[PDB]
């Protein structure tokens, strides 16, 4: 799915990721019978001309877009927009989950958090079955498509976004900043990227969800984050500690001891 630079209209900036800038935009395309179709899109732009990153940046989105699952983000295509590398993605009204959590943690309850966790686990189980590694599971990379509306019996609806640049090519300084989302074995060797990687990160993301969007270890510097792993610290149990044991099971320093997503789904459904 290749798109032209002329077809893309940049609107307001909407934050950034690792070596990436986000913008609200409009995708313009000519249809048959002279029709003009405009689509509200999120534009993910790679800073400068990062060549090795662009390949990793796009290789990740491409592999995931080849698959179809209702809790995975929809990518429309890419633009080698001259001096820009752009991923064109569906626009989500309510933004990322971490921002939504910190603003609504007052009116979010155990059931809301369990449903959202199940949808994520369903997406991760689907990726596990297809042996596809995400590598950057975090609340910031979860998108809220729909708010809860019990009046109409509608649950919240989230989607897992793209990984971005792979942690196998990023500067180790960046990986250390992403502790405790980047699992320990990837801090010692970024070639340890495995299916077990995403199970750890899912645990950290569950901690975010239970903690109302608090970012674990965000106050610490990179050296204390490293020491956190060197001494095999675990994150403390959230106030809403209904998922503490599952978080601990997922954040196991031994990759082989992390539960399958089939089992994570079992543990989540049992709480209901």
Q: Which two tokens stand for residue 74?
A: 């929809």
Yes or no: say if 144 and 92 are a contact pair by the CB < 8 Å rule: yes
Q: Where in the chain is the domain with CATH 3.30.200.20?
A: 8-90
Yes or no: say if 209 and 100 are a contact pair by the CB < 8 Å rule: no
Yes or no: say if 45 and 85 are a contact pair by the CB < 8 Å rule: yes
Rounded to whole angstroms, the Cα distance separating 38 from 31 reads 10
Query: CA–CA distance from 168 to each of 75, 171, 195 (Å)?
Result: 23, 9, 14
Method of determination is: X-ray
Rounded to whole angstroms, the Cα distance separating 148 from 99 reads 16
Tell me which residue of 192, 197, 187, 175 sits closest to 250, measured CA to CA. Answer: 197
Rounded to whole angstroms, the Cα distance separating 245 from 227 reads 23
Q: Does domain 97-271 have CATH number 3.40.640.10?
A: no
Rounded to whole angstroms, the Cα distance separating 114 from 209 reads 9
Rounded to whole angstroms, the Cα distance separating 180 from 234 reads 9
Rounded to whole angstroms, the Cα distance separating 215 from 60 reads 25
DSSP the chain: -B--STTEEEEEEEEEETTEEEEEEEEEEE-GGG-EEEEEEEEEEESTT-HHHHHHHHHHHHHHHTS--TTBPPEEEEE--TT-EEEEEE--TT-BHHHHHHHHTTS--HHHHHHHHHHHHHHHHHHHHTT-------GGGEEEEE--BGGGTBPPEEEE----S-TTTS-HHHHHHTTTTS-HHHHH-GGG--HHHHHHHHHHHHHHHHTTT--TTTTS-HHHHHHHHHTT--PPPPSSGGGHHHHHHHT-SSGGGSPPHHHHHHHHHHH-
CATH annotation of 8-90: 3.30.200.20
Residue 78 bridge partners (DSSP): 2, 87
Q: Where in the chain is the domain with CATH 1.10.510.10?
A: 97-271
């Amino acid at each position: 799915h290749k798109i032209r630079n002329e077809d893309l209209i940049f609107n307001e900036s909407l934050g950034q990721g690792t070596f990436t800038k986000f913008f609200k935009g409009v995708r313009r395309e000519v249809g048959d019978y002279g029709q003009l179709h405009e689509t509200e899109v999120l534009l993910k732009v790679l800073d400068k001309a990062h060549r090795n990153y662009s390949e990793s940046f796009f290789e990740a989105a491409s592999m995931m877009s080849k698959l179809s699952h209702k809790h995975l983000v929809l990518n429309y295509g890419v633009c080698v927009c001259g001096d820009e590398n752009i991923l064109v993605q569906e626009f989500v009204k309510f933004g990322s989950l971490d921002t939504y959590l910190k603003k609504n943690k007052n009116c979010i309850n155990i059931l809301w958090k369990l449903e959202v966790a199940k949808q994520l686990a369903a997406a991760m189980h689907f990726l596990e079955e297809n042996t596809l590694i995400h590598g950057n599971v975090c609340a910031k990379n979860i998108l809220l498509i729909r708010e809860e509306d019990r009046k109409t019996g509608n649950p919240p609806f989230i989607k897992l976004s793209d990984p971005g640049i792979s942690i196998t090519v990023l500067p180790k300084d960046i990986l250390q900043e992403r502790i405790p989302w980047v699992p320990p074995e990837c801090i010692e060797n970024p070639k340890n990227l495995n299916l077990a990687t995403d199970k750890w990160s899912f645990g950290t993301t569950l901690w975010e969800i239970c903690s109302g969007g608090d970012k674990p270890l965000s106050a610490l510097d990179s050296q204390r984050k490293l020491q956190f792993y060197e001494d095999r610290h675990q994150l403390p149990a959230p106030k809403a500690a209904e998922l503490a044991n599952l978080i601990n099971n997922c954040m196991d320093y031994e990759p082989d001891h992390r539960p399958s997503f089939r089992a994570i789904i079992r543990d989540l459904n049992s709480l209901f």
